Design an enzyme around this catalytic site. Structure first.
Site, PDB file in Angstrom:
ATOM      1  N   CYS A 183       4.169   1.702   9.145  1.00  0.00           N
ATOM      2  CA  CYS A 183       4.017   0.551   8.266  1.00  0.00           C
ATOM      3  C   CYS A 183       5.395   0.159   7.719  1.00  0.00           C
ATOM      4  O   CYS A 183       6.271   1.009   7.516  1.00  0.00           O
ATOM      5  CB  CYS A 183       3.013   0.896   7.193  1.00  0.00           C
ATOM      6  SG  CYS A 183       1.313   1.132   8.002  1.00  0.00           S
ATOM      7  N   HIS A 228       0.816  -1.221   0.000  1.00  0.00           N
ATOM      8  CA  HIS A 228       0.000   0.000   0.000  1.00  0.00           C
ATOM      9  C   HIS A 228       0.838   1.253   0.000  1.00  0.00           C
ATOM     10  O   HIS A 228       0.301   2.385   0.044  1.00  0.00           O
ATOM     11  CB  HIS A 228      -1.040  -0.019   1.140  1.00  0.00           C
ATOM     12  CG  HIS A 228      -0.517   0.114   2.540  1.00  0.00           C
ATOM     13  ND1 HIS A 228       0.032   1.277   3.029  1.00  0.00           N
ATOM     14  CD2 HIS A 228      -0.616  -0.727   3.603  1.00  0.00           C
ATOM     15  CE1 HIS A 228       0.326   1.122   4.309  1.00  0.00           C
ATOM     16  NE2 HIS A 228      -0.072  -0.080   4.685  1.00  0.00           N
ATOM     17  N   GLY A 278       2.906   6.050   9.476  1.00  0.00           N
ATOM     18  CA  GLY A 278       4.268   5.954   8.987  1.00  0.00           C
ATOM     19  C   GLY A 278       5.060   4.785   9.546  1.00  0.00           C
ATOM     20  O   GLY A 278       6.208   4.566   9.111  1.00  0.00           O
TER      21      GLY A 278
END
Ligand SMILES: *SC[C@@H](NC(=O)CC[C@H](N)C(=O)O)C(=O)NCC(=O)OC(C)C
Ligand SMILES: *SC[C@@H](NC(=O)CC[C@H](N)C(=O)O)C(=O)NCC(=O)OC(C)C
Lengths: 306, 306
Positions: free
Chosen positions: A145, A41, A143
């Protein structure tokens, strides 16, 4: 001599963290050999997340559209491909800091350390378990991820988790390093909600053995029970059913303490029914279930890594 | 988005850990630049510990009597001296992995990360506080002496603790890196016992602000109080008295949540008197006091290091 929630030393994984920016989205990736792993993503905007078509969104992407920064050096992307829910970005230089490593998909009840990162830089380290509903209870903000979970056995890093999502209830979901989500979660901003967060019975038992070793013994009742009878009480308290394999796994802790596993089960039963009446076990007023039997052994004997 | 006991990334300190053997005693030391720091009781046998005369025991020691191993390389000792309760062993080669660093003596209530080591090798990492009785509640076994505690602010490592002793009650004592014990403890195997383990009031308050941020708000009562009245209830529960400086330090958390510090004090009062009636706050049934206000801010905003 004390017992603490303790993560693995993180230096090995630190030297694998980079920053990945695509479009206006930045997150973390994992640089091993000449490949950078990161959540697919990365290619979505915040609009794209309710209903992303990843294959379509990828068509408009080329190697040069992924900017990867290690400290203050750009790696050159020479190829990229989607694998399940991760992107693998081929770069032209092998990370010189790559550890000995492997990718493992862990089972519910298993534990690992998370190195939380932002913009490719480490922020901190803590221990998690893969819950039976396949969430984890972490600490992750926008952030984070791409942060990973791992175990270390001597010199070998086993990567088992990549962070992708936070659900409306504030627990966390993610993939193995092959990009397969743990549990039924998807990388879409939709109605998905965690199931019953049952307790990892075998880990609670492990931790009571840990307590006995370290001097907390008030709960050592004077009963024993049977697997079947104990599980009838575990059920109502949303405890994972205890199996013979679980008994087998505690065998070593049983032998060090002289306390039979079923006797410990009887003590736990009485704690589930009568409470702790204000007492503490290893400085918790709750029954802890994110230590494995192997974690206990490790910590109570002093196993090292490097 | 979750809140967890989280240590600093440890890779920086990992590359400073070595093994120090003297006679038949082996423990850990810290190699910074061309000096190795370690507990002076490295020179004692197990007999020597009831009543060591360190100055006398040192006379029979020469540079070549300290064997220092980094992985599988011997460093050559070119000088040694005792400073308070640590030895500083001058070696002929500066650690090439030395970080930017400083030595700090922390105050009670302050937090830090411990890298537990055995035989110069890292075993794990966890967060501690310097308790008001100047113990810490760690996880340390035979051979862990010389493990250090530190904080990281960006690229700079502040070393604040070296591990030396475990008291009969299973809590732990140690020095700053200048070799001065925290509290009244000594490197002798004698009758020394910890004082009252009072609770770090300001850190509990910090953690309640943390809970509010992350969705746990049931405890937000509808009172306020005064410093003096709140402290009359802290006293009986063995809580550290709350000062104006403490109020000042929470100012930022107060401003982010919109909840006045004294209002939070009133909520805490009611928790101390009435209990938690089985409820949980951030998955604890006890009131947690090993987060500082700065820890909370750090974790709830995502401050990074490298
Ligand atoms: S991670 C060390 C090892 N991997 C294994 O064979 C796993 C079994 C044990 N954990 C062990 O023997 O350590 C290895 O040699 N890995 C090298 C490596 O980098 O493999 C990647 C898949 C490339
Ligand atoms: S650790 C970074 C710095 N030390 C300081 O000046 C402390 C103040 C702040 N924490 C900061 O500016 O980072 C430094 O330059 N240290 C170098 C070093 O190795 O010093 C040792 C005492 C030799």
């Amino acid at each position: 001599s004390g017992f603490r929630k303790m993560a693995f030393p993180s230096g090995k994984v630190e030297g694998c963290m980079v920053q990945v920016t695509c479009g206006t989205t930045t997150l973390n990736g994992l640089w091993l050999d000449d490949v950078v792993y990161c959540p697919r993503h990365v290619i979505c905007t915040s609009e794209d997340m309710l209903n992303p078509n990843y294959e379509d969104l990828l068509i408009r992407k080329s190697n040069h559209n992924f900017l990867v920064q290690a400290g203050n050096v750009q790696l050159r992307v020479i190829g990229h491909s989607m694998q399940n829910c991760v992107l693998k970005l081929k770069v032209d230089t092998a990370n010189p800091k790559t550890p000995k490593y492997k990718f493992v998909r862990i089972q519910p009840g298993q534990t690992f350390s998370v190195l939380a990162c932002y913009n490719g830089s480490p922020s901190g380290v803590y221990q998690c378990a893969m819950r039976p509903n396949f969430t984890i209870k972490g600490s992750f903000l926008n952030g984070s991820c791409g942060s990973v979970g791992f175990n270390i056995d001597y010199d070998c890093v086993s990567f088992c988790y990549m962070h992708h999502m936070e659900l409306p209830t504030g627990v966390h979901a993610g993939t193995d390093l092959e990009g397969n989500f743990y549990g039924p979660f998807v990388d879409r901003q939709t109605a998905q909600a965690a199931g019953t967060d049952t307790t990892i019975t075998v880990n609670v038992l492990a931790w009571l053995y840990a307590a006995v070793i370290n001097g907390d013994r008030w709960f050592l009742n004077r009963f024993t029970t049977t697997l079947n009878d104990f599980n009838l009480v575990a059920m109502k308290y949303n405890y994972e059913p205890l199996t013979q394999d679980h008994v087998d796994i505690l065998g070593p802790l049983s032998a060090q303490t002289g306390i039979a596993v079923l006797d410990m089960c009887a003590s736990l039963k009485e704690l589930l029914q009568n409470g702790m009446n204000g007492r503490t076990i290893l400085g918790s007023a709750l029954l802890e279930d994110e230590f494995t039997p192997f974690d206990v052994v490790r910590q109570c004997s002093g196993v090292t890594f490097q």
